[PDB]
Design a protein around this ligand. Structure first.
Ligand SMILES: Nc1ncnc2c1ncn2[C@@H]1O[C@H](COP(=O)(O)OP(=O)(O)OP(=O)(O)O)[C@@H](O)[C@H]1O
Ligand SMILES: Nc1ncnc2c1ncn2[C@@H]1O[C@H](COP(=O)(O)OP(=O)(O)OP(=O)(O)O)[C@@H](O)[C@H]1O
Ligand SMILES: [Mg+2]
Lengths: 463, 463, 87
DNA sequence: CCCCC
């Protein structure tokens, strides 16, 4: 009995509705997996696949009440969760899945085995996914204008290519990249090109994810990054002028983890999967509230140094020290990019870069030598080291150099340490930094009298 | 079988219901696309469209329960999403779409192709959309009073026309405009005229979008500009009297982007499409917290200099240097404008100006010479040149002026550079600006020594 | 489970305390990158909070919840690099 | 329930 129960069982036997570990209901319609808590996806699937059931079952599914009964039966039948979005080298489209390691495009049940629950939102066109075209030469000219193929720009260009290509691989990336440069240098053009290329896998959020508390309450600004392969933030302010909050290192470290806590309004799903490449456009370098060794492992910088100016302001730009090259501005390029002219050309370029930079494992490495905020830590980290045991047979040398021994621990006088620091970094130049380092790296032998359990590398080098 | 399903399929075959990429269901009623998130209009469409169905189908749609069944069927039928508001040269009305490029007015299925989800809110009158009328003469008299057709006011008048006409096109603009003048000069009259002309494509917000962070929590002030073609802000709080917040350059840069990040109350949507010309009525010049070249790329100024006064204060007005002309105030003009007397005359004028200023691509250009804040930067840009390869083969002569060579680069001492700068600008004028420039462009070979790699134009010119 | 330095350098109860609530049937709690006390101008870990953690039911509630009586079967492991200072 | 507070 229960024709409706039989219909629900038949639909469940097709493996077209699945329950995820988070609590979602993903359905397979029109050659793609979709989930949406606001749309009647299960009844949509029932109506869509009414054609694959017997003729006596097809006519029963034209009634919304009966479709809702079938949906209730299916919901009670789904008891086990599944693992979704586990292939980091598959790019999902609206009509199939592209193999990023092989170049094969799968449609239908071939693409169904990879439970890719997101998509670009548009259809793959193999007649445009071609190497040579009128659009490809123009796109290559644009890219070579933005990032010149010169010898002094080799490393920066390769880093730019790697960062752009990493927006295809759906895994957790462990760095935050900063597109730094002066005005009119191509950063927004690059952003728009990437958005056109990867479609719905691209999202843009606010600086609140960098300068606010992520726990909070309902946070759609974080909940909108679930499974996105690229996240953009833009327009960092100048932190030198007091009045702007600094970037939270806690947020920076929390954004590189495989899961991020944040939930929408009227929703109970708090944890989102992190597959994102986070890129920040800025005219100014970042300043963080607190600097430590971990934070320095998650920051990378790509610099833009080509100006596109109108003919009136070309001469003033040619004498600027923030530009290496000046080019003529193009006034139709924005519209051409907006109309998705270079979508498949840039997609092909990104796939080629993915192949080139995906030597067995692809990983993003930090560039801490570019951020001025990290210079004080980087310099002093190679000059002073903790107490020494194998250098214990040098206590006479330490005493002659000014150090003292206390429980076989090297201690330096505060005044002597200040005088030594003044040589490498002037007091007038970095008094706040030197005083903070003295107060932070030193232990308190008393309320007033204290000592630093850190000796200079050069002092120990002296025999 | 299933008359209701047949009705639903027939209605779906007319493409009168669409599902948008933001999750809305837009319906085609009364020659326009409409949607309401809090109260869907699909049943309204069913009732309205019942007249185009067979006679045996029209009678079933008089029952709300049957209409709801048909709506459920349609909702299950709608699977794919569509893109809306993609034509910038179409002006939507409540009964059709006006082709700005061509001049033809489309109604019916001709206006259906352009999925414009916004409208002016009033119907287009072809009889009032005429060049020869009693209203047009008065309107041109008013406009020539506000912005005279002299030779001194020619560029200002052209900028005025361009900014006013740019409120008809649905595309992202690159500049923010300031309507600057003294009191009783026609700025609010211009705002009211434009509001009367374009109806619901016009919005007015607060200064929070200029002086406050946009992401934060729910911000209806920034979320209400979605797809608006004109945004007005008024009455900047003069910043000389300390106690008023300054304008955020980060906000200025963010308001120019094609997408603005901000959400309403009880909404998960965090992106808004920027189609708006943003204008601010001011008695005072803007003051920004940080001034850089990226800010000086997005500011334009139109100045109003005609005074409309009561007969009593005419002489005290004529002895004022802020006015180039004094006329007689009209007391019925406010009511005449509020009664939509010049709506179609001003609309015709705006379309004519659109055609005039839409040489193939129309673009808003900055006017950085009208802001006194930018003067120091503009002068410094001309009074200095960055040392280059050509500067190297000049050291033997540059030593006469005190210039030195270090690291194969021509540089000058900090004290000498400070004295040279003081020789051009006094301390009391821009001491803070000079100090900020020195801090932001200083090259410190040692921690105690600082220098600038810039040369004065006079020394380079002299041989 | 792993939590930041909020549980140590802030109020354990406060308002919403997800960090405190995450120890609910969590046999191990980890803390990383502790704020060494040599710097002047930082908050302090509370001996009262230590005693509260030693109590057989530590104060802690989830968001929009009143079931603050969450049983404690947790041993906290705190990882740092500098000697702590207790007032 | 969010927002508000
Ligand atoms: N290769 C190119 N050749 C010619 N014109 C270009 C090229 N790339 C970009 N342009 C144009 O020159 C200008 C460059 O500004 P763009 O918005 O790309 O960068 P930006 O000012 O650094 O960005 P942001 O919005 O982050 O400040 C734009 O008007 C763009 O259309
Ligand atoms: N061409 C004109 N001829 C006669 N009267 C005019 C004309 N244009 C405007 N007026 C009237 O003169 C007055 C000027 O006020 P208006 O609102 O235009 O000034 P405003 O520049 O916005 O002033 P404020 O800066 O104080 O807001 C109004 O009463 C307006 O109706
Ligand atoms: Mg006014």
């Amino acid at each position: 009995g229960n024709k409706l129960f039989n219909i629900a069982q038949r639909i469940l036997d097709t493996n077209s509705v699945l329950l995820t570990e988070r609590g979602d209901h993903i359905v397979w319609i029109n050659n793609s997996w979709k989930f949406n808590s606001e749309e009647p996806l299960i009844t949509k699937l029932i109506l869509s696949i009414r054609h694959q059931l017997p003729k006596e079952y097809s006519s029963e599914l034209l009634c919304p009440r009966k479709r809702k009964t079938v949906e209730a039966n299916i919901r009670d039948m789904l008891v086990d969760s599944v693992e979704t979005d586990t292939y980091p080298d598959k790019l999902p489209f609206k009509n199939g899945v592209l193999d990023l390691v092989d170049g094969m495009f799968y449609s239908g049940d071939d693409a169904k085995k990879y439970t890719c629950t997101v998509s670009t939102g548009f259809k793959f066109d193999d007649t445009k996914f071609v190497e040579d075209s009128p659009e490809m030469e123009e796109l290559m000219n644009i890219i070579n204008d933005i990032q010149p193929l010169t010898d002094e720009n080799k490393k920066n260009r390769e880093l730019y290519e790697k960062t752009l290509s990493s927006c295809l691989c759906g895994a957790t990336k462990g760095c935050l990249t900063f597109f730094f440069g002066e005005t009119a240098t191509g950063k927004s053009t690059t952003k728009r090109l990437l958005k056109s290329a990867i479609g719905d896998l691209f999202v843009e959020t606010g600086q609140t994810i960098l300068t606010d508390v992520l726990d909070k309450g309902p946070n759609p600004f974080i909940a909108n990054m679930h499974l996105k392969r690229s996240v953009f933030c833009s327009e960092l302010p100048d932190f030198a002028c007091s009045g702007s909050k600094k970037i939270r290192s806690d947020n920076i470290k929390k954004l590189t983890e495989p899961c991020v806590i944040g939930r929408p309004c009227f929703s109970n799903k708090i944890n989102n999967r992190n597959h994102a490449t986070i890129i920040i456009d800025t005219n100014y370098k970042p300043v963080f509230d607190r600097i430590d060794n971990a934070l320095m492992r998650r920051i990378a910088v790509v610099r833009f140094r080509t100006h596109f100016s109108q003919p009136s302001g070309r001469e003033a730009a040619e004498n600027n020290d923030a530009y290496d090259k000046v080019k003529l501005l193009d006034e139709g390029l924005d519209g051409k990019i907006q109309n998705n002219r270079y979508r498949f050309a840039f997609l092909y370029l990104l796939v080629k870069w993915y192949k080139k930079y995906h030597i067995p494992i692809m990983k993003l490495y930090p560039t801490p030598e570019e951020i001025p905020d990290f210079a004080f830590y980087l310099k002093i980290g190679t000059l002073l080291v903790s107490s020494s045991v194998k250098h214990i047979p040098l206590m006479t040398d330490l005493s002659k150099k000014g150090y003292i021994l206390y429980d076989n621990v090297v201690t330096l006088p505060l005044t002597t340490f200040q005088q030594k620091i003044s040589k490498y970094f002037n007091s007038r130049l970095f008094g706040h930094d030197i005083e903070s380092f003295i107060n932070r790296h030193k232990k308190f032998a008393n309320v007033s009298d204290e000592y630093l359990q850190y000796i200079f590398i050069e002092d120990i080098s002296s025999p």
